[PDB]
Amino acid sequence: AVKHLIVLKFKDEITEAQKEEFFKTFVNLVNIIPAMKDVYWGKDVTQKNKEEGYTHIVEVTFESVETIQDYIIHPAHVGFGDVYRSFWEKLLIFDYTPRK
Amino acid sequence: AVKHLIVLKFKDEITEAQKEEFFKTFVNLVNIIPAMKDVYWGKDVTQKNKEEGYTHIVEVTFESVETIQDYIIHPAHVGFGDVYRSFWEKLLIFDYTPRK
């Protein structure tokens, strides 16, 4: 399985309630985008690199690297971006196959 | 469960074989550090983050936020840093509880 990892910082003006609604909406995308198999998110608790400012993590599970693209251009994902684009200040994205 | 996420970039002179052995050794820490419950790593394939350059992800599972400290100061973890810190150029650390 492939992981789509999002590391993000919200803009200062976004409230806690707004962040909660943002993540709730994103988690619920799993039901309507076939390529999305699972979602978890969380807030960093350690603040080891404050200077970089990232605060939140989202992890999305996919069957393959190829199905990530199905998710990217799915109208529900495009709609999510259209609605919440103003919420985030910056993000890092990674796509990888977990191994050990 | 709490996840301990390491986001890394290697120095340019580090070989592919060195990277593989680095992760093999890191994964094997589970056997000698009780607090480590699981580990996976992976290499980003998308390279969508222009200015930051991080290439690899390590995720370690812990039973609680408290047991992360048992890993942090464990001599096997300190030793890993002493042997391999010259391998990485920079790293970001995050600790979070995955949720819906």
Dig out the tokens for A40 from the structure. 């978890």
C-beta atoms of B94 and A3 within 8 A: no
C-beta atoms of B7 and A3 within 8 A: no
B56 phi-psi bin (left φ>0, alpha ψ -120 to 50, beta other): beta
Q: Which residue of B has its CA nearest to A23?
A: B100
| Contact partners, residue B65, CB within 8 Å, separation at least 6 | A45, B2, B95, B97
Q: Which candidate in A27, A48, A100 is best for mutational testing of the B interface (most B CBs within 10 A)? A: A100
Given CB atoms, is A78 within the 8 Å cutoff of chain B? no
Dig out the tokens for A94 from the structure. 């990674």
Resolution given for this structure, in angstroms: 1.6
- Catalytic positions of B are 71, 74
3-state secondary structure of A20: helix
Order of strands across the sheet that contains B88-96: B38-43, B56-62, B2-10, B88-96
Instruction: List the one residue out of B3, B38, B68 whose CA is nearest residue A44.
Output: B3
Q: Considering its fold, how many domains does chain A have in total? A: 1
Which residues of chain B are within 8 Å of residue A7 when distances are taken between CB atoms? 7, 92, 94
| Contact partners, residue A71, CB within 8 Å, separation at least 6 | A4, A33, A35, A36, A60, A62, A77
A71 tagged catalytic: yes
B61, B23 contact by CB (below 8 A):
no
Which residues of chain A are within 8 Å of residue B52 when distances are taken between CB atoms? 92
C-beta atoms of A46 and B100 within 8 A: no
How far does A13 lie from chain B, in Å, by closest CA?
Answer: 23
A71 is an annotated ligand-binding site residue: yes
Domain residues for the domain of B54 are 1-100
A54 is an annotated ligand-binding site residue: no
Helix (H) / strand (E) element for A77: namely: helix A75-84
C-beta atoms of A45 and B95 within 8 A: yes
Dig out the tokens for A74 from the structure. 């799915």
**What's B84's domain CATH number?**
3.30.70.100
Dig out the tokens for A68 from the structure. 């990530």
| Contact partners, residue A38, CB within 8 Å, separation at least 6 | A30, A60, A61
Strand partners, A67: none
Instruction: List the one residue out of B95, B22, B31 whose CA is nearest residue B64.
Output: B95
